[PDB]
Design an enzyme around this catalytic site. Structure first.
Site, PDB file in Angstrom:
ATOM      1  N   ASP B  49       0.867  -1.169   0.000  1.00  0.00           N
ATOM      2  CA  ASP B  49       0.000   0.000   0.000  1.00  0.00           C
ATOM      3  C   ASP B  49       0.905   1.221   0.000  1.00  0.00           C
ATOM      4  OD1 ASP B  49       1.039  -0.220   2.520  1.00  0.00           O
ATOM      5  OD2 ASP B  49      -0.845   0.114   3.589  1.00  0.00           O
ATOM      6  N   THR B  82      -6.024   4.436   2.806  1.00  0.00           N
ATOM      7  CA  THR B  82      -4.883   5.321   2.998  1.00  0.00           C
ATOM      8  C   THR B  82      -4.582   6.106   1.733  1.00  0.00           C
ATOM      9  OG1 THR B  82      -3.912   3.840   4.645  1.00  0.00           O
ATOM     10  CG2 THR B  82      -2.435   5.395   3.527  1.00  0.00           C
ATOM     11  N   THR B  83      -4.183   5.398   0.676  1.00  0.00           N
ATOM     12  CA  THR B  83      -3.910   6.016  -0.617  1.00  0.00           C
ATOM     13  C   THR B  83      -5.029   6.952  -1.044  1.00  0.00           C
ATOM     14  OG1 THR B  83      -2.517   4.193  -1.329  1.00  0.00           O
ATOM     15  CG2 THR B  83      -3.617   5.490  -3.050  1.00  0.00           C
ATOM     16  N   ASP B 379      -6.919  -8.124   1.198  1.00  0.00           N
ATOM     17  CA  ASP B 379      -8.003  -7.533   0.427  1.00  0.00           C
ATOM     18  C   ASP B 379      -9.355  -8.095   0.831  1.00  0.00           C
ATOM     19  OD1 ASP B 379      -6.080  -6.118  -0.912  1.00  0.00           O
ATOM     20  OD2 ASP B 379      -6.101  -7.390  -2.704  1.00  0.00           O
TER      21      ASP B 379
END
Lengths: 510, 512, 514
Positions: B49, B82-83, B379
């Site tokens: 990530d 987050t991204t 995921d």
């Protein structure tokens, strides 16, 4: 001057120049602050909490400068915060904007023996009619919206949106538990930081609220002899593991013997010191824990000075290291002591309620301190402004709505008087717009637009700007009949104090 | 005691905040370049990530530190988002910089941020779709298809649909958390891909061969499990000594007294309660000789992540000794069964008195497919857990992101002022997220994005560009499935994570 | 390395003006208070000609001499250091011009003599005998206080000034060494300059407010031990035998409880009542248990009121220093009609006052205790030294440069000798005299010559002592105003000028001496 030698940081050019210059440039904070603002200052005193602030006091706490005035002048600005919490984000910009008004007259060549007088003279003329433009007063201090109204300029001045519940919360705090008869206390009613919940969930739990964990039991009796000890339990002689497995099966016991039977006599004499609550500045050993519960002594596993200080303050405590049987010079103050879940956190609650010495304590619940401090900052400067000890605050038009009121007072009075002070007094009729600009800046318009339309309102008392759309184009927020009001106290001070600063700082040549 | 005032510091804040987003630009759909990053510690540092390298990067900036902490404030919640937050708030900050020169600087700064971020969440929960146990799915068939969402979205193979139910097993078993710290997954090299396994407790990949290791039980139906954070080896208690000899009788002894203690050390837990002894640290010959003298199970060097989840599973405790310990500190199962899978000496732990651990066992018979699905398990986990937690399920891949900025381009008309600029910047931020997964779909972003806009002047239900299908269409009906809760979360972050420092163009630092 | 002739002479006149350039901003009510954060490194504020010098660490050699001569002046005066420094370089200007037009420094100084005389003689010729009266003394007070501070705060300082001057006249002292006592007080405002008819005591006690209000004092000021010590010492320190220490520690406490129980005997003997206070005042500290034993009985036991107190206590109160409690009479002690232990700010300040035969009547100044409170602490003291002179002399001439248009203009009218050998020093002398009247007059934005010609002619016309209005730079009449120059003040600054103005004029060469 004409010498290779002697000394100065000020003088000559500099007095006319550097002493006025950076003292103004200090105002950039107060130029963006005092009244509703979203504009803030990240101030890193390197705490690993990177501190949002508009509050001049803790903005100027870091700021250090060779300019003797700007070196000094923060004094009067901080001497202000002592006297009123709000109005301090006003202090630095007003005089700071009022300063170079004289320096332009110095460019005109209007003397330091001259100009500041007219300011001082209109500083009178202000404080002459400044009490006349007082309108309301904060009367019943148990009442929310007489207290929260004063709060509704003050926290607002510091910070905008959060203000409203705070003002409620602070008035719901009832800092009037202190009758405000000449009584107010910053430690007894205290801020207690709780990570998480909401800041709308941030409450006032009366007593002394310690987010530190009540360990084991609660007090034997609610009027405790409160054992506040820096290191009552550090451990006596600790256990070890030698081989990255065990040291020796034999060597295990003798250290618990020293631990237990000492912490026996330790906590037995924490019982023989009569401690109903033992409040540990350091950690706790599970043996003393067991002892604290058997000997029936409320145990606090860890204590910050935040505890220990207020403990020493309120309880009459002295936080003490103990490897030995103790004695309480702490005793208690408290008529009540608890583990309560506040912030929905198990909390050490010391408690009582009186008029005087009474602990009725704010409990702030926020994800960080930068939440719970700058807001507290915003908060407490209203709590500080609540401190008048003239119960009626003599509430003037809030939000600086008295600017336009005194502005035409001083400019008309500047017309009356002749001589170079008439300018200085008319120059004193000027720096009013600073906060209206400071508002109109964080609001996004020039004070001219604002103040000229509020030169059209002439005598108004109500309308003045802020951070809002009303503060941009309309040049109007109603800051007298508002809910947003401010005391005459900080009005008596800031206009005079920021002047008291600006008095001799041009005079100082050396 | 240092500060930079005005716009110069303000604009200076964004790039330090933005550059890290230029890394994560699409790190969710992973494709791009990944450089192995070796820090000044000699530590090779990578991520699945943006957050972990963000965890690794530090700044003197409060600003660049904030959105870091904010993306981290979003990170550890879902384990994801987050991204997203990393791009969006920086994108705002990225887009206001030219506005900042025009100026947004009046606190008309902060308003349209959160003012328009509710418009999104106003649109979120009205378009949100809730899933249940009888509804379209078992909610296992959802967590199947949400695994088939999360697992399959990246490749792999119909085991992704097989795992889709299989991953949900320990999920359903342990479902409380959004994440696996109770669950965990056992990588199995050997077997094959088509069979992957799940155990109702920890199952140790490998425990380790010794002298008498074969001569020690690999099987217990009544394991009483010493759970050791600590080794027992020949080095643990010395066999080295000496003694005076005018008679050689004592050569046997001076070593033997120490020998007795190696025995006694391991035996004293063995004698007290212990059958199974699981150490996460070495077991050497002369110690394991006594462990082989015991023939109540010995282990060493075993995973603690399993061993502490064994504590979770069993009800025993991680033990910092072999001694001073009771029989309750011992782990317990109704199964200790070691049947070696591949090279992994594979301990079955199940029938635990509690079994707070239930671990999915991914068995690939090969390395590559697994760690791709093991990455897709996180995921699935981050989704299939959250797919239970919030049953209201939005869709990603520019589903609403293109549909929001659609209206949020449409919301520009009514704004005009200084913040209509924000509205456009706020809008297309939603669309700068798929603006990569377009490239990960192989697509040009903008035309595809503009199509999606037209597709949201045509459609606008779930429609979006999905690197999942590498198409443009309804996401939620494309099996792009994540709860609508994280949206508000990210959007509570998105507009607000940007408004922090833009509220500050004067930023003070101090040496102290 | 050397500097020949004019070089070393250039260094002379060079450094002199910046001094005065401070003074042109430092002189009179027109002058300005000077904050020095550099000078000693301290954070400071000052108005005076003498004080600003010494506050600085001054690296220039010419200015190493300069802080010297105004010192002895400021001792007497308190003003004119803000002035004498002006006339010197103003004289150095002339003396330079005359060697610039060419001359020796000797034939320069030769003309100072008769010029100095005739002006020093004009001191006699002018000298205004002013019957020395609190009113007139207020004026001589405030003029030096106005010189250094606000006329507002001048009158604030003036009272306590003119308060203790009649009270030191009460002590039959024409100068003032006592009731010079200026007591800083912890306050939010320096605005308060007050008077205490007796001392302001330091520590009521570490156990505070014992008897806080004593309206009849029996004062025992005693350097005795009610704190002898409570701690662990053997011979008085740590000896090599640890067990031998605490053996004498109790007897140390007991010798206190010797003196304590003596007070129980003494307060009895002295008072027998809490009504008329027996007051222990200890130059050392006092044990809280001594205090406790004394406080509950209605006794106030003060500790560590300093030796200045031990005098002024023994002095102002009609008090005593008696170093053994034992048993004593109330009349074996002094008496003060008020001893009150008073807290404004941190410390409790015990006010021993209404002191019988006051030898010290304390001048209270409340405030932040900053350089600010010091800034009103020096001017008063300086103003005290002025009215000290005003008490000293029976003749005080006007201030505000009223003297020189009477003085210099006469010497401007005539060479005292009416011969050119004087003119060389008379032009220099008579000129330098007019700086003070012209400077603040021109500092106010009023050209000197037009300002001087009036005040000059206004003396020539009216025979008037005719002042300047220092803030408005206009001709005023300082005879009535109250800006007034002590004959004691003005005389030495002339000498102080001359004494320092000759040798430096007569030294044409400087060289490194080591």
């Amino acid at each position: 001057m004409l010498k290779e030698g002697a000394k100065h940081f000020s003088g000559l050019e500099e007095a006319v120049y550097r002493n006025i210059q950076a003292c103004k440039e200090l105002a950039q904070t107060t130029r963006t602050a005092y009244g509703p603002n979203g504009m803030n200052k990240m101030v890193i005193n390197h705490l690993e909490k990177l501190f949002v602030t508009n509050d001049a006091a803790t903005i100027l706490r870091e700021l250090e400068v060779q300019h003797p005035a700007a070196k000094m002048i923060v004094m009067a600005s901080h001497m202000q915060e002592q006297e009123v919490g709000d109005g301090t984000n006003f202090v630095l910009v007003f005089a700071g904007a009022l300063l170079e008004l004289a320096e332009e007259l110095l460019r005109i060549g209007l003397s330091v023996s001259e100009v500041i007088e007219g300011y001082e003279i209109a500083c009178r003329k202000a404080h002459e009619i400044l009490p006349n433009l007082v309108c309301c007063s904060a009367k019943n201090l148990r009442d929310i919206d007489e207290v929260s109204s004063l709060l509704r300029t003050s926290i607002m001045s510091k910070q905008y949106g959060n203000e409203v519940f705070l003002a409620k919360l602070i008035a719901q705090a009832c800092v009037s538990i202190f009758p405000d008869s000449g009584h107010f206390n910053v430690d007894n009613i205290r801020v207690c930081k709780i990570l998480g919940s909401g800041i709308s969930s941030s409450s006032v739990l009366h007593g002394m609220v310690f987010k530190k964990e009540t360990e084991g039991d609660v007090t034997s009796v609610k009027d405790a002899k409160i054992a506040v000890y820096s290191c009552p339990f550090d451990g006596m002689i600790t256990e070890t593991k030698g081989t990255v497995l065990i040291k020796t099966a034999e060597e295990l016991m003798n250290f618990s013997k020293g631990e237990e039977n000492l912490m026996d006599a330790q906590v037995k004499a924490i019982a023989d010191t009569g401690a109903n609550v033992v409040v540990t500045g350091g950690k706790v050993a599970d043996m003393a824990l067991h002892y604290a519960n058997k000997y029936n002594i409320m145990l606090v596993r860890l204590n910050s000075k935040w505890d220990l200080r207020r403990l020493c303050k309120t309880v009459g405590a002295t936080a003490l290291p103990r490897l030995t049987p103790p004695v309480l010079e702490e005793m208690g103050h408290c008529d009540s002591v608890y583990l309560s879940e506040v912030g929905d956190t198990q909390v050490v609650v010391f408690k009582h309620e009186k008029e005087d010495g009474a602990i009725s304590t704010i409990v702030l619940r926020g994800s960080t301190d930068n939440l719970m401090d700058d807001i507290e900052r915003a908060v407490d400067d209203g709590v500080n402004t609540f401190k008048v000890l003239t119960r009626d605050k003599r509430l003037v038009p809030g939000g600086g709505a008295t600017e336009i009121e005194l502005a035409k007072q001083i400019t008309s009075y500047g017309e009356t008087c002749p001589g170079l002070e008439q300018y200085a007094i008319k120059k004193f009729a000027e720096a009013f717009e600073a906060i209206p600009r400071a508002l109109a800046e964080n609001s996004g318009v020039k004070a001219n637009e604002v103040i000229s339309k509020l030169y059209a309102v002439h005598q108004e008392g109500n309308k003045n700007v802020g951070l809002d759309i009303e503060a941009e184009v309309p040049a109007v927020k109603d800051m007298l009949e508002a809910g947003i009001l401010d005391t005459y106290l900080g009005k008596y001070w800031a206009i005079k104090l920021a002047t008291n600063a600006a008095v001799t700082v041009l005079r100082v040549d050396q | 005691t240092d500060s930079s005032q005005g716009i110069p510091q303000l604009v200076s804040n964004i790039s330090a905040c933005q550059v890290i987003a230029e890394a994560v630009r699409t790190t969710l759909g992973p494709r791009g370049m990944d450089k192995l990053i070796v820090d000044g510690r000699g530590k090779a540092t990578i991520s699945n990530d943006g957050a972990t390298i963000l965890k690794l990067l530090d700044v003197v900036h409060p600003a660049a530190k904030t959105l870091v902490d904010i993306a981290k404030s979003q990170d550890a919640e879902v384990g994801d988002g987050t991204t997203s937050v990393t791009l969006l708030a920086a994108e705002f900050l990225k887009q206001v910089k030219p506005y900042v020169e025009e100026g947004l600087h009046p606190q008309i700064i902060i308003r349209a941020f959160r003012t328009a971020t509710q418009l999104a969440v106003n649109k979120i929960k009205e378009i949100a779709v809730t899933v249940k146990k009888a509804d379209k799915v078992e909610q296992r068939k959802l967590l199947e298809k949400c695994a088939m969402t999360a697992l399959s979205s990246k490749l792999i193979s119909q085991q992704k649909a097989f795992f889709a139910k299989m991953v949900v097993d320990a999920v359903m078993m342990l479902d409380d958390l959004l994440q696996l710290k109770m669950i965990g997954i056992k990588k199995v090299q050997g077997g094959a891909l088509e069979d992957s396994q799940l155990v109702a407790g920890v199952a140790f990949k490998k425990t380790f061969s010794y002298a008498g290791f074969e001569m020690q039980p690999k099987k217990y139906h009544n394991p009483k499990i010493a759970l050791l954070n600590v080794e027992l080896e020949l080095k643990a208690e010395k066999d080295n000594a000496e003694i005076r000899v005018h008679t050689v009788e004592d050569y046997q002894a001076i070593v033997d007294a120490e020998w007795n203690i190696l025995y006694d050390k391991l035996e004293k837990i063995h004698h007290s309660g212990a059958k199974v002894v699981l150490s996460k640290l070495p077991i050497g010959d002369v110690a394991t000789q006594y462990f082989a003298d015991r023939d109540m199970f010995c282990a060493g060097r075993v995973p603690e992540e399993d061993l502490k989840r064994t504590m979770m599973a069993c009800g025993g405790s991680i033990q910092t000794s072999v001694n001073a310990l009771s029989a309750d500190v011992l782990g317990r199962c109704q199964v200790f069964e070691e049947t070696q899978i591949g090279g992994e000496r594979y301990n079955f732990f199940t029938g635990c008195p509690k079994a707070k651990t239930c671990t999915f066992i991914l068995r690939g018979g090969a390395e590559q497919f697994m760690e791709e699905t093991e990455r897709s398990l996180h995921d699935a986990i981050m989704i299939v857990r959250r797919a239970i937690k919030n049953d209201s399920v939005v869709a990603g891949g520019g589903a609403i992101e293109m549909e929001l900025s659609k209206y949020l381009r449409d919301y520009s008309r009514t704004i005009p002022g200084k913040q209509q600029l924000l509205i456009g910047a706020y809008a297309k931020a939603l669309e700068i997220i798929p603006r990569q997964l377009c490239d990960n779909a192989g697509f040009d972003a903008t035309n595809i994005l503009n199509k999606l806009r037209a597709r949201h002047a045509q459609g606008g239900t779930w429609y979006g560009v999905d690197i999942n299908n590498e198409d443009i269409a309804d996401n939620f009906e494309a099996f792009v499935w994540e709860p609508a809760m994280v949206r508000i979360n990210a959007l509570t972050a998105a507009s607000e994570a940007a408004c922090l420092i833009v509220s500050v163009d004067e930023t003070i630092k101090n040496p102290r | 390395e050397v500097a020949r002739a004019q070089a070393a002479l250039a260094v002379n006149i060079s450094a002199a003006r910046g001094l005065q350039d401070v003074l042109r901003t430092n002189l009179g009510p027109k002058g300005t208070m000077k904050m020095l954060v550099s000078g000693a490194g301290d954070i400071k504020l000052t108005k005076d000609g003498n004080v600003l010098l010494h506050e600085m660490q001054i690296q220039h050699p010419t200015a190493s001499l300069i802080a010297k001569v105004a010192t002895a002046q400021d001792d007497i005066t308190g003003d004119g250091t803000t002035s004498n420094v002006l006339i010197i370089g103003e004289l150095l200007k002339q003396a330079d011009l005359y060697i610039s037009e060419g001359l020796h420094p000797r034939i320069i100084t030769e003309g100072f003599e008769a010029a100095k005389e005739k002006a020093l003689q004009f001191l006699e010729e002018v000298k205004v005998s002013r019957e020395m009266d609190r009113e007139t003394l207020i004026d001589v007070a405030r003029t030096s206080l106005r010189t250094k501070v606000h006329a507002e705060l001048a009158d604030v300082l003036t009272e306590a000034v003119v308060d203790s001057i009649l009270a030191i006249k009460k002590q039959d002292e024409p100068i003032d060494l006592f009731m010079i006592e200026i007591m800083e007080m912890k306050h939010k405002s320096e605005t308060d300059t007050s008077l205490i008819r007796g001392l302001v005591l330091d520590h009521g006690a570490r156990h505070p407010d014992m008897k806080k209000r004593v309206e009849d004092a029996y004062i025992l000021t005693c350097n005795v031990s009610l704190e002898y010590e409570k701690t662990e010492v053997n011979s008085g320190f740590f000896y090599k035998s640890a067990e031998e220490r605490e053996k004498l520690v109790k007897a140390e406490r007991k010798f206190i409880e010797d003196r304590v129980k003596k007070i129980i005997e003494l307060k009895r003997k002295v008072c027998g009542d809490s009504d008329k206070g027996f007051v222990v005042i200890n130059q050392k500290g006092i044990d809280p248990f001594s205090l406790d034993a004394l406080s509950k009985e209605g006794i106030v036991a003060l500790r560590r009121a300093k030796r200045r107190n031990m005098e002024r206590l023994t002095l102002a109160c009609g008090g005593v220093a008696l170093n053994s409690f034992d048993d004593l009479s109330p009349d074996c002690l002094g008496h003060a009609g008020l001893v009150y232990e008073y807290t404004l700010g941190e410390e409790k300040f015990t006010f021993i006052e209404k002191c019988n035969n006051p030898r010290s009547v304390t001048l209270l100044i409340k405030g932040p205790n900053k350089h600010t409170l010091t800034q009103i602490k020096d001017a008063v003291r300086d103003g005290l030294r002025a009215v000290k002179n005003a008490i000293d002399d029976g003749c005080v001439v006007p201030g505000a440069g009223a003297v020189e248009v009477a003085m210099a203009e006469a010497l401007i009218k005539h060479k005292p000798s009416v011969k050119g050998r004087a003119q060389l020093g008379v032009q220099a002398f008579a000129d330098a005299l007019l700086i003070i009247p012209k400077v603040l007059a021109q500092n106010s934005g009023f050209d000197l010559q037009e300002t001087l010609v009036k005040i000059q002619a206004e003396h020539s016309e009216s025979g008037q002592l005719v002042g300047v209005d220092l803030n408005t730079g206009e001709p005023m009449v300082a005879a009535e105003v109250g800006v007034w120059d002590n004959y004691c003040v003005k005389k030495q600054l002339l000498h102080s000028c001359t004494v320092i103005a000759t040798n430096i004029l007569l030294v044409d060469e400087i060289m490194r001496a080591g």
